[PDB]
């Protein structure tokens, strides 16, 4: 009921029926969940 009209619009923003902006880009990166998958950042953990 709360999130029925929330939508990715043709401007790539996420808005509800009122047209208020919920997110500027869906998921904050503008990517669909199907295509993404887990990966490891190589430069994070290792020492200097």
């Amino acid at each position: 009921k709360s999130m029925e009209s929330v939508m990715v619009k043709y401007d790539a923003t996420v808005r509800n029926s009122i047209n208020q902006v919920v997110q500027l880009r869906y998921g904050e990166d503008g990517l669909a969940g199907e295509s993404v998958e887990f990966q490891n950042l190589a430069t994070l953990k290792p020492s200097n």
Binding site: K9, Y10, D11, A12, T13, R15, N19
Partner: protein, 79 residues
Amino acid sequence: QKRITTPYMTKYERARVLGTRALQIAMCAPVMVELEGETDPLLIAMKELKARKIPIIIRRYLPDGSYEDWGVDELIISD
């Protein structure tokens, strides 16, 4: 000119375009592609989509009330 929408055809756009064009073909609309042994309007519409010959223009309405008119031939098909 001055188009901000994605150049790619959305999945929903593809579905609606295919359905509408198949309905027209079933209602005997001229076929823009050369069909060979094809009778199913959906298959004919898919062939036309692959050929980028579907004579349909998508009017994408932006949130601000403006709209952009994109040709099916102009858009990039997922397949």
